[PDB]
């Protein structure tokens, strides 16, 4: 059992009131290494929660997958990433483009696959609770604010 096999990404957090939250889960082997969830999909949010560097660290190996003959798909957001693209202009050099995300769209190591499946594995359900959380889904039976 090793990673040459494909990767997944989970990523499907329910949105609630029409308002979406990022959720990530990144997963070797069937193994979930770690998991999270947020609300702002923005590259100044690293000041706040530092998985930026992870999900930079990602972009090299959607990179190095090219090299093996692998892709990821992702199955929720395909949409804000389609923002920083349109930034200034066109991207110019890997750094621009790495600022515009979106522009990875030709390359064919990353893709949207829309499916409608409620089928979700254990370890999506474990990431979409924790968008909820995010959005201050706790227990009806508990509470959290401030005066």
């Known amino acids: 059992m090793d990673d040459r096999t494909e990767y997944d990404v989970y990523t499907d957090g329910s949105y609630v009131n029409g308002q979406y939250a990022w959720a990530y889960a990144f997963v070797k082997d069937g193994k979930v290494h770690y998991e999270d969830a947020d609300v702002g999909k923005n590259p100044a949010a690293a000041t706040m929660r530092n998985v930026a560097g992870e999900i930079a660290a990602a972009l090299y190996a959607v990179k190095k997958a090219s090299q093996l003959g692998v892709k990821i798909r992702i199955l929720h957001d395909y949409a804000g990433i389609a ?16 600022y515009a995300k979106l522009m990875n769209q030709y390359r064919g190591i990353y893709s949207f696959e829309k499916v409608k499946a409620h089928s979700g594995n254990e370890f999506n359900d474990y990431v ?9 889904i706790r227990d009806l039976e508990h509470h959290h604010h401030h005066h």
């Not at 923002?83 to 790495?98: C, I, P, S, V």
Request: aromatic share 16%.
């Open 83 to 98: 923002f920083w693209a349109t930034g200034e202009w066109k991207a110019k050099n890997e750094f621009t483009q790495a």
């Open 128 to 136: 979409d609770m924790k968008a909820k959380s995010a959005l201050g």
